[model samples]
Structure formats: C-alpha cells, structure tokens
Target: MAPVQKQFREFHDRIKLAQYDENQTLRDERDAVLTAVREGLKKVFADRGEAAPTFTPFNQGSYAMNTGVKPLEGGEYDIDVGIILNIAKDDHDPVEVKKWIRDALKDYGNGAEIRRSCVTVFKPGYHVDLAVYADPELSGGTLCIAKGKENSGDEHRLWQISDPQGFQDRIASKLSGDDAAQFRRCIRYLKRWRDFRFSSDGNAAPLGIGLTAAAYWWFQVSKRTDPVSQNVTYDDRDALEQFVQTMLDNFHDTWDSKDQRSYPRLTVELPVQPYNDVFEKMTGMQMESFKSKLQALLNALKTAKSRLELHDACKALADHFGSEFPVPEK
Candidate 1:
C-alpha cells in the first residue's frame, strides 16, 4: 500500500479511450465504414441483377462493452462489427456470403479481405472486422455466423452458431455502480498490458474478448468507505492485482510426457450462445506463456505493494505496463 492508486488512475486516464475524444473518432470511423459497406453492397448486388440482402450492422467487442483502451503507438485501432443478414444460414454458402461483404468494401479505404471468421476492412487509422450472422428469425432463434476464408473449401465453409449481442449484453450487465466502473478500468489496464507485452502478430497472446469474458466471470471490486468523512476510495492496484491472481488461480496444470514439463491452461467460455472457450485458438505452450506472464504481473504488483516510495512502486508497474504508465519523479 504505497498510495499508488493515484499513479494507477493516471495510467488509466492515459490508456482508456474516452467517449468524447478518442472514442468519438472511433465511432465516426465505424459509421463511415458502415455507410460505405451498405452502399457498396447495393452496387455489387445491382451488378448481379439481384437485390442486396438487408443487414443490420452494430458495434461489438470492446467498443460495445465500453472497455476499449487506446492502442499502442503505431498500432491501429481495432473495431468489431456484427452484420446480421436477414436470411437463413442454410439458404447460402458461408464463404459466398462472406464474399458479398468482402466484395463490397474491397476497394474502400486500404482495402477489405476475407478472413476465417470475418471480413476485415482496413483503414489508415483503424480496421473494421465485420462478422456476418444469418437467420435471427429462424426456429430456436440462435444466429449463425458465416465462417470461412475466400479460398476455403466446402469442408471449411459453413455457418457457426454465435451470439455477439447476447455476449455484449452479458458484459454490460455483469456489474453495476462503482463496481462496474472498476471492472471496466481493470480490464482496460490488462488490455494495455497485453498490448505492451505481447507480439502484435501472433495468437500467443490472449484475445481481448477472452480477457473480457474472464473479467465478467471473475473480477471483484476493490473499494472502501471512510466512516467519518463518508468518502469512498477505489484501489485500482488492489483490484488488478487480485484479478490477475484470480486468473492465475483458475489455471489448471497438466504434465506433458513428451516435453517432460508441466503447462498451465485456462479456459474462459463465451458467456452466450456457442459457449466456446475464448482461448481455443491458443496452443498449450501459448497458454503456458500466458500463465507465466500473469505470474510476472502478479509478482510485480506484489513488489509494488511492498515498496514505500511512490516512484519505486510505479517503477515496478511501468516495467511491465510500458511508458504510458506514469512513474513519479519523487
């Protein structure tokens, strides 16, 4: 308890994407991209002598969850969008459906390309990932997303069940009041740490959604109220430290006979439909690396807690969280 909460607040202020400034730019970017997509799709279908399917586009992921953080310098802002096509999944091929979206925005901005799970439209400042879902009106009412790359074959091209809206709702409703505020700030801090520590190109780092889902499941509030003054104080450092410890605590260790070493693994299931493990894309070795990193973060937090000087305390955190995290002179 070196009174590092002030420094943590400064770190959060530096990293968090505020609604009026950084996030407003993101919102404008998203709206512009959506408009381009709608117009482009209409023309693409017109050339084919068919009416373009009507779709509803909305924000998803961190932006939708209100937990978005500023990207590291030289990193592009990432936006997740969900396009629910008013059509049945069984009526069309998944890759073909994805192609319609890719074809629409391929020439817009930097360009658009079809990925395994979504069609990515790249912009100079940010990129929009459009995840297409179909059949919201179908029996049972679970939306199925078009999944496949442009070159994927029949076996890989198929619709997969998803519930992006439901997932967003789950994150939104998990906590309320001051508890909710701390939850979002803690998640943002962790995201910035991940961005600072992990390579931008690989799946070795945990996905933002994975960390979000984990927070929804396990993060706890850290605050106290003073009786005399009736003043409430929030300890972000304590909140984040406990959250990371909880994440590390949840990991299960398994011995690998081939490698003759133990690996730690964590599985955070998407809280909505499909219920798939958010970390499913990561390998065991990657999971082990993730665990070790969490352990390192936990150790850093503990060292910061033990320190008496505010500068010394912040130095421990800045080592892992990068230069954006403020370290006081005295």
Candidate 2:
C-alpha cells in the first residue's frame, strides 16, 4: 500500500492584473521587471561616466524556484525583487546614482514613487518595484557588498560575509546522501531549512531551501554508486531493536526545532506547506502538530546498526511514499 501522502497540483497558476502588468500571467512580468531595473541601474552608472556596470539576477522567495506565489484571484501581490551589479571601489556615493535612476524613469511618468529600498513606478497601466544592488569581487574572490535595500531607501549597511555562492558551497560539502545509501537527504535538508527558518537567531542565508532542494536532489544521484558501509549484522532481531532505538535518539537532534515553527518568518516560504504536508504524513500528524514524525522516521534511518534493518525502512518509504530513496544494505 502507498503512503497516503498529499501533493499540491494546482498552487502556482493563479492570475493577477494588479502588478496592471503587460500580461495576465506573473511569468510575463517577473523576468521583465528585473531586466528593466538592471538596465536602468547600468545607465545610472554610465551617465555618471563611471565604469560600465554589469548586473545579474539574485532572488529569494518562490519565484526563484519556479514556484508561483502570486496573490489569490483579485488580490494584491508582494513580489520580492533583487539585483546583482558590478561596481568600483571608489564610486561609493550611490546617492548621486540614485538621482540618475529617478530622472530616467520620468519618461515612463512622474507618478513613479522615488524613495529608499526599492523603486516603484506607479503608472496608470501597472506598477513596477525594482531593486538595485552591488555584488563586488574583492581579494581576487572574497565577497563584498556595495549596497542593499529591502522596502525603501538605501540602508547603506554593508555585510561582509562569504560570497553567497562560496558560503553555500562550504555548507553543502558537509552533507551526504544516496537515493541508490538507501538513505534520503530530503528529510535532512528540510530539517536544516526548518531550523534556519524558525531560528530566533535570524539565520537567513542567500542560498536558502531552494538551494537546499537542489543540493539534496543532486546528492541523491551522486551517492548512488558509492554506498555507505555498515558494521552491525541485521541477522539478529534483538540487536536490531536496540539499533532502531538508538536511531530514534538521533532523530531528536534533527527535530529539536519542531516547536519553534510558530515564528512569524515561518509563514514566508514556498516549501513550508508541501514540506509540512510530507512531514505530517511521515509523523501521522498535522503540519503544526507537536507530534514528531521526524523523531520516529529519522530514528529508523540513522540508528539501524544493521544494513538490512535500515534498508527495510528506507524501501518502505520510497516504494510506498515516492521518495527518491536509496536501497538499504542487504
């Protein structure tokens, strides 16, 4: 019998006209809006006769992963926009560049609101909110930020962390999985995502769950050939019980944040709903139900001292649940 799991088949296709967009679909404007902002930003730098600016797209939220998050029918949309631009070490005065953009948009109309954080030009036809940022390369490869704003004027606050790409690479290096280890990395990645998301410490990262999904998806295939080895023999049933019990204990660490899901930021996510559904299915509880399936399931995945016992649980999940799980050791 299959695990009676829930799958969302019709979530991303809602239509909207508020963002009086060129087309009825969100896809039509999502890319175009970003392109226009980057282009306008470059013109700002060139008019100043500063070094030519090159910009790329950096994104957060569902749209980054092709997950649609438009407002419900006849509702408002809150699209998050971001831009990555190349800049010089000397041109620190973005205040002047800011004016260049404000003037450029005048061709569209005067109603465009020019302020801080993002640029929103409210035309009679539609509205566009654009963000401009500088992603600089320092020390041949070290990361540097020029400027970033969220909702309004430039905060001028600088964050000097690892290049978002490099930082994500480092974290991904520690993860292991095999669709073929008879193990699943999806649960682990989701756990990490939940932890970072609900964390009171505010540990938001550039490469969030979308990146986590890609990593786990890739690792699933990468580990197919090189299976992890195990020592305990599954031939003994008594030994198996103790092994599974220990597996349950390891689950505790993975699920420590289940209660922390009530945080405000928890609501702002794409995977939260489906992930919660799947997690709920695993635990036989509701998405917010305090009952922990993480503990029950991860315990079996981690604590099985013998290969066969681990394989049994994994096969059950994949065969019955559609998880891209690895085959357990015989």
Candidate 3:
C-alpha cells in the first residue's frame, strides 16, 4: 500500500466500533435495566389477566446494526430497544400500546420519561429508549411503531409504519463479512465527521440514520469492485476516498426557476420499504450546513491528490475528522 493509504488505514482502525463495545460495565447495567423493564411489562400483563398483552424486547438502530459510535465526551449514549407486543391493531389504539410501556415502566423507574414513541429509562452510564411496536405479522398489517410527534403543540399519538428489520436486512444483504465491517467503519467515520463539523445539537446536525442510509445507498451504486473477484476492497486509499465521495455524491443541486437561483441540498432516502427520506428530519439550514462541510472535505481530498508527503495527506483527513485522527509519527 502507498504511504497515504497506510495512514488512512491506521486512522480508520483507530476510529472503529470496538471502543463502544468495550464498556462491559455499562453494557451489563443496560442489560439488567432492560431485563427488568421486559419482565415488569410481562407481570403487568399477567396481572391484567384477560387483557394481558404479550411482548418481546429486542435491540434496534445503531446498536443492533453494529455501527454504533461512542458518544462525544460527557454525552449520554442512547440504546434503542424495541418492544413488539402480541396484539392486533384493532384490539388497541397506538396510544394504548405506548401507554402500556409507559405504565409498565413507571415504577421500574430509573428516571423513566414517557416520550411519544417509546418509554425512556435513564440509568447510570447509559439510557434505553424502549420503542413500542406491534407484531405486524400477527396483526396482518404493516409493522408500525407507537410514537407521538415532538413539539407539535397538540399531542396526537399514532402508529407509524416503519421497517427497521427490513432496513437492516437490506443493507446486510448488500455487504457481508469484511465488506460489512468496512461499510460499518465508513459509517462511523462519517458520523464522527458530522459531529465534528456540524452543530453539536440534534437539530443542527444531520441525523445519524440519515447519514448511514445515504452512505450505504451511495456505496452500493458507486463503489469500485474487482471485476474478476466481484468484490470491493477497503484496504486502499480508495476506501478513504469512497467515504468522502459517498457524501458528496448524494447532494443534489437544482435550479429554482421561480427564484432564478441554484440551491444545493443533501437528500438521502432509505433504500428499503417505507422508503422515507432519511434527511426528512433535517432543517433546510442543517442540510445546507452539511453540504458546505461536505464540500470542504471534498476540497481537502482534492488537495491531497496533488501533495506528495504522507504527513500532508494525513493532515488533510485530520482537518476534517479532528484531533483524535492520528497523525503519522514518521
């Protein structure tokens, strides 16, 4: 490998997912808390006798996908746990399902807060967002999550059809083994870049799911693969380039005929069922901010192309990812 490629490999390895999984104590704490939540809910149902609803709790989001990143210093990391209940949609309203989780968790309380979609329990070291859902296979309907709109003034609860499993399976089917590992590594890398460059708060930065979905979508279409081997390799400088290029490629520029000016926007849609826009949560300003940050990284990569020294090449990457990105000692 070239010197620049070697440097990038080191940085990628340094930023990978192992650190998040290293928190065994935190992991154990979460496991105990979640187990209590699950068991407590079962008791609540049994106590109800005829009305007792059965359910299963499973991990979701970045945690289950193994693309999870460690939180920024002093920030509370969230684990998304889903509660899929065994009940038909006709039997209970979505709000009632949400209410069941909330009611069951009320006394199990390690700082339990009932949100629109899930019941969140704040525990030491980390928190669990217990998202409520119904078994779509049993319900014979679309798989939906019980969630409420945030800050909508009027509190309205509804079942929103979402296929988290489908999204996971789709991305998994596209990449496996080393391919999956590299894909996840790239997601983590760009996620850190997002935090470093964009607004530190939720609304100001691009959403994590949005960024991950787009990266995978772009990667599937544009990533270079060996023709004879029919596989992609991430051990080269191309891996680093692939990460930046994926971000840049998804941003679309369109001319607003009415305004008579061109506007740049980042749009990422989930490639699976429910096919929602991953960037739908991002405000217009946030999208623009992401585009601007992306353009800067693109510029840095372009400069790296003309530079010779390995140190200079690594510096370009560090400029985007921040101080934690290792600079080659040699």
Candidate 4:
C-alpha cells in the first residue's frame, strides 16, 4: 500500500481495536440478562395457568446481527430481544398483547416501558427491549408485532407485519467471503462516528439498523472485497473515503455517475415483511440535523486524506469520532 494508505490503515486499525471492539464482560452480562428475561417470561406464562401466549425469546437487532458495538460510553449497554409468542389472533390486538408482557414483567421488579413495538426492561447493567411477535397465521404466514408509539399523535396503532429473522438472514447472506469480516467493522466504525457526532441523544441521527443496512448495501455495490484468507490487509484509506463519500452522496441525493439524478438514501427499508422505512421515527428537524452533521463528517473525511502526517490524520478523524479514538505517537 502507499504510505498514505498505510497510515490510514494503521490509524483505523487502532481505533477499531481500541474503541469499537465489544466488551466481553458486557456481552456476557447481556446474554445473562436475556436468559433471565426468557425464563421470567416463561414463568409468567406458566403462572397464568392456561391460555396465555406461549412466548420464546430470540436475540434480534444488532446483538444477533453481530454488528453491535460497545456503547459509546463504558457505562451503558443496550440489547434487543424478540419475544415470539404463539397466541390466538382474534383474542387481542397488539396493544393488549404488549401489555401482557409489560404487566407480567412488573413482577420481576424491573421498570418497564411499552415502546411502539416492544417492552423494555431496565436493569442495572443493561436494558433489554422485548419486541412481541405473535403467531404467523395472523400475519400472512409470518410473525407480526403491534408497534405502538404512545402519545405521538398517531392513533390506532395496530399489529404490523415484522420479519426480524428475514432482515438478519439478509445481512448474513451478504457477508460470505473474507470481506465479510470488515462488514461488521464498517458498521461499528460508522456507528461510532454517528455517536460521536450526534452525541447519542437529543438529535435525529440515522438509526442503527439503517446505518448497518446502508453500509452493507454500499459495500456490496462498491465491490469493496478482498480474497478469503487469514492473513490479509486492506487499503483502509480508499475504503474509508469511499464509505464517507457514498454515505454523503446518498444522503444528499447527489447526481450519480453518468450524471443522472439518484436518491439511494431515500429510505432504509427492512428487507422483509412490512418493509417499513427504518427512519420513520425521525422528525423533520432530526433528519435535517443528522444531514448537517453528515455533511460536516464528509468534509472531515476529505481533509483527513490530504494530511501529511499520521498525527494530523488521526486528529482529523478525531474531529468526527471524538477523543476516545487515539492519536498517533509522536
């Protein structure tokens, strides 16, 4: 690789190892919590003494997808759990069904919230969002969820078709070769960058799954691939630059090659039933806020490449990703 590419690779490698790597202890804690939550839900069903939804918990979202990064701060960890409940379709709508889990979980002494689609349990170490999915019969031979957003001025929330498994499988199928490993890394990097710039709250940044799908989608299109091997390296400079430029152009809907108008970033839809836009939750202001930061980061990506020294490159990256990303040794 060229000297510039070498520096970019080394800088990103260090950042990857230092900031984006998952914490083993936290991972363990998350798993342990899931097991407990699963057991607790089972006990609730049994305690009902008959005719309750038979629920099974499965890992979903980033944790199961293998694209999750450690929370931006050391103290916070969040995990997603899908509670697949086999229940009668006509007995209840999504609201009552979601309430069943929330009410039952109250016995466990953990705080609970009925999110649009899930019941999140708060724990000292981590929080697990339990999305309730009912029998496939009601959902055109696929599971569904009653995703409700309380007091958002959108009334009459009802069951919607959901296929978390399909989305998970889609990601898995896309990552098959050596390039697949970098797939998750790019997700982690993008997430870290998002958290840094957005500060993880009070802003309308891209959703986690949205970012993952977008990165994986573009990685495939760009053919950012390498041979399957144990010992291999990448021109991180080129790869990283492409990622930023692609993300920026997509968000801005800039003209594509051949000078044709394109709008790839118009939506990040789930690759499964419901096929809903992931950014549906974003308010108009939040979308605009996210775009402004994306533009700033795009500028930083270009500036970093023009720097002559590793220190300068690292600093440029830090501007977008924050101080936790290490600078080069002088």
Candidate 5:
C-alpha cells in the first residue's frame, strides 16, 4: 500500500473546522445567534401576555459530535441547535410552536424562516437551524419536535418524535481513543468527497447526518503496527475505502413496477427515537446517483493505494476531495 497516511492527515488538517474555542469568530457568531434567540423568545412571550417559557439550548449534528469539516471557500458554515421548550407536546400545535421560534428570530441577522423541520436563521457567513422540541422535562415523555413550514396545512403540520441527544450519544459510543479519532477523520474525508462531487442545491446528495450515521454503523478502524518501532499508523485511505464498500454493499436493489426496472437503495436509520431512515428523503434516482458516486470514490481510493509514488497517490485523492487536499511532490 502507498504510504499516504501523512498526506491524508495533512488533508484532514486543511479541511477540518477549528474547534469553537480555537476560532474566536465562530464562537462569537454562535454566541450572538443563541443570545438573539433567547432574548427574542422572551420578548415574544411577553408581548403575547403569556408566561415566558424557559428552554434549554444545545448543539446538535456534526458540531455536537465533533465531526464537522470546513466548507468549500464559498460555502456557508452551518450549525444545528436544538431548543427544548418547557411545554407539553399535547398542549400546542407543532406549527404554532415553530411559529413562535420563527417569529422570534424573524428580524434578527439576515432573516429567519420556517422550514419543514426547523426554524432557520441566516447570517452572513453561517446559518443556524433551530429545532424546537417540547416536553423534554416531563417524566417518561418523549421529546417531540415541532415540524412544519410557515404556510403548511394542518395535515402537513405535526409534532415528530425526536432524540437528538440520544443520536449523538449513539455515534459517540461507537469508538474511543485513537480509533474514534480515525473514525471522525474518515467521515470528514467522505463528506469532503460528497461536497466535491455533488451539487449543493437539491436532494441529489445524502445529508451529512446520513453519512455520519452510516459511518457509525459501517466504519472500521484501519491501522498497522510496526513490531520493531512499536508504533501504529492510520491509513485513512484504506479506512474510507472499507467504509464506502460497506455502504455500497448495504444498498439493496428494489423493483420499480412503474419503471419496470430496479434501483439500488441505501437506508441508514437514526439510532434513537423515531428511528427513521436518514436517507428517506432521497429518491430512487438520487440513491442511484449516490451509489455511482461511491463507486467512483472507491475506485479512486484503490487507484491511489496502488500508486507507488506519494505525489501520484495524493494527486488521485485531491482530484476527488478538491484542491485543499495536498498533492505532495515527494
């Protein structure tokens, strides 16, 4: 195998987002958004002459799991925040609760708008997605999220059962120590590959959560130890290849009667409450595209592994992961 582990680590360093404490700008931006939401929520409740609802705000998604990667040069940074409202799910309509959040942040930053799953507040270089959940404090009450668009009908508006923290814990518990670090790097590599290969605008590509969940299930640590030196080296290229192959293997072919053909489908379920397949939003055609893309990535990894020189191997990888991945001359 080509000894490109050093190059792979360099690529990860180039693409990974700096930790919140290390990046003052990211920390300030996050703090500003959270503060705005808290104050806005309080004012909205007061203006309505209702007792202000206390809530707990927590990080979710990649940021919470520490698997986030830096976006492409022109891409906006994204954060997912969950607001646990101190109210019962049965007491309020889901859309109404979403409206409360939307109304609160509407005038802040770039603007706030309601999506099917969360209230999104946009800022210049980043966007915050605030997902509202109810009954988090009640004993034995499952946390339910408010889901609906601003103009969604009654049928389209409802509370959906969620377990954001549980999902985080599940992914966190999958590996530990050095193994866990490699797992995160492998996920980041795949994410960068996705960003490089797929269009950003539509559902053509899988969500980051989908890729994360898949890694939680399929990723295996790839490392080798030298007997003489008693040192272990990680091969991200091999690890990513293994994970991608597993994901492609998991995709099952389903018959489409209307089209009179079959297409491959990959389903990665959330490992917590509601347990819906994260890739459920992707259509058959989209899944087909994802499979083909993975196949291409796998081929690239194999070719890179086969290369004898470091420069040739890194070039093969940088082609798929973009220019940030270093193409060392040696």
Candidate 6:
C-alpha cells in the first residue's frame, strides 16, 4: 500500500469530517452547526433575486485543511464568507455592492448587524463577517483588497481574499529566497497540523485559530533568526531540508513535553493575554483546552519569522491541498 503515503491528519478535515467519525450523533451536530451559515447564504442570495454570488474562502482564517484561520478554540468554528463580484479595472464603487449583500443576507432573517463598513451577521453559534469589494485587477481572483473608506494613508487595501491555494502556488515557485523560505516551512506546518491537542473536537483555537495565527507569520513576518534558515532560496531543496530539520529539532524538546497532546500541529499565535483574551469569549470557545496548543503557538514565532510574502504564502498553502485546485502561476 506504499505505506499509505504517510498522510498528515489535518485539523480541519478531522473536525469538518471525522471528529465525530467515532460518534455519529456528535458528527451530525457538528455538520448542522457548520452548514447553517453555508445554507443561510444560499437562501439569502436566492431571495434577493440577485444571481448567486461566488463565496470563496478568504484570508488565513479560511485557507487550510484544519480549522482554517480563527482557530482560537477547537469548538469555535467560524465560517467566514466572501460575497464577491469582479468589476472592471477602473470601477471604484465598493459601497454600493457591499450594501447589496447586507440587504440580501438581511432579507433571509439573518439580522446581520453593521459595524463600521462591513455587513455583519451574527448567528446564535456562528458569526459570519460578510464583505464585498470590486476587483479591478482581480489579482488572479485569489486575493482581493478592500478600502474601509474610513481609513486613509495605507493604500494596501485590506485584503479580501480567502483562496489559500492561490497563495500556495506563489510560494512553491519562489521559496528559495533567504528570508522567504520561512513562509514555506510555516505553511507546510499549517497544511499538515491536524491536532496533537486536547480538544480533539471542534476546530476553534486548536485548528481554526491555529490557521489564522499562522497567517500572521505567513503573510506579515518571517519568524526565522538563524542564518542557516536562510540558506534555501528559489530551488535549494537540500537547504530547505536542513532548515526544516533545524526547526524540528529546535521545537522538539521544549514542545515535545506537554504540548503533543495539547497541540500536535504547528505553533502560530501572538500572545495577547489582556486585550486579546477575548478570543475564548468571542466564539464561545474554551481557553484551557489549548494549553499545549498555546505553547505551539509560541513556538511558531521561533520558527516562522520570515518576511511577509502574501502572494507566495498563499501559493504555498494552496499547493498543500494537492490536485483539487487549478492554480495559475504568479
């Protein structure tokens, strides 16, 4: 059987499909809870008489096999949906389209609240952050940015993209750079992080939060400090292997102790004890469950301090999902 290909039991898949494989009753409940937002969107679109809008997962929160991003908890599974429309390169009116989705989701009795500029819909257990944007360049349709219209000075339009696979392609193609390889290694850990944690159930902190936390490293900063870590660039396979080995060794002793059961996957999170402590409260997730996962989150910073290569980071993530994707090179 070729050793079954040595698959990594990812966090999202286990939570999304197999968490309850051992308990059908719980599995059914998990599925129902998740499908609510997905189905709710369908109903809303249909009622509005607007053609069904495309819902592509965006950001670090929606880009992985395990909980996606926002995994601050195992049971806290938040389904973030992007209601999109691609306008011409010069089209700049985003508010008009943003309002359309607000109306559409509202018509479905979602009672989504509006915060600042986005149309927010808060379900009992699940919260969906609905956003709309006009993609002039389309940026290959993987990641699109949006201006809040409230903040200025930063033209880096807040990215409105959820396509993880799209970014993965960009990474594999250019991971040989000195500072860029950190993203590749970080992404690989994310794609395969299936939970060596305690929850072993919903993907809130362990899986979802785990995914989102990694996005910070994958998208914003490189977590590496070692000079050898920068050896791989654009095609140095051996150098990459050495870097990965060093990362594993560095993380093995400290994390191998109590973290394996708390979090079997990779580490990725910024410590925000006071102001950010709301993660446990936000999604009705439990905090204590992620004790070891938290350590892994701490460790992630040690290994993932690479430079922000957004396009490339996402490309690396997409590649991990295997052949189900048809991504064009950047």
Model 6 over residues 166-233: C-alpha lDDT tens digits?
A: 43343334444544434433443443343323334644534434333444334432232447655422
lDDT of 4 by residue, 98-144 (tens): 77777666755366788887888787756878888877765457577
**Best-fitting candidate, measured by TM-score?**
5
Q: CA lDDT of 235 in candidate 3?
A: 51
| Model 3: residue 207 alpha-carbon error in angstroms | 1.8
* Model 4, residue pairs in steric clash: 116-147, 116-148
Clashes per candidate (backbone, < 3 Å): 0, 9, 2, 2, 0, 48
Per-candidate TM equals 0.93, 0.37, 0.81, 0.79, 0.94, 0.35
The TM-score, computed over Cα atoms with residue i paired to residue i, of candidate 1 is 0.93
Worst 10 residues of 1 by lDDT: 17-26
What digit string (tens of lDDT, one per residue) describes model 1 on residues 1-330? 226888888888999886423467778888888888788889789887888988888788788888988888788788888888878887888888888888889779989888888999988878999998886685247788888887778888888888888888888798888889889999999999899888653569789999999999899999888898888899888888899999999998877788898778898998887898989888788988889889999999998888988789899999889999999898
Q: Output the TM-score of candidate 2.
A: 0.37
Q: Rank the candidates by TM-score, best first.
A: 5, 1, 3, 4, 2, 6
Model 6: CA > 4 A from native: 1-76, 114-118, 136-143, 149-165, 168-330
Count: clashes, candidate 5: 0
Candidate 3 ranges beyond 4 A from true positions: 18-30, 42-52, 107-110, 149-156, 220-237, 240-243, 253-263
List the candidate 4 regions with Cα displacement exceeding 4 Å. Answer: 2-51, 107-110, 137-140, 149-155, 220-232, 252-266
Candidate 5 local lDDT, residue 73: 68
Alpha carbon lDDT of each predicted model: 0.86, 0.37, 0.69, 0.66, 0.84, 0.38
lDDT for predicted candidate 1 compared with the true structure: 0.86
| Model 6 error, position 98 (Å) | 1.9
Deviation in Å, model 2, residue 288 alpha carbon: 15
What is the alpha-carbon lDDT for the whole of candidate 5?
A: 0.84
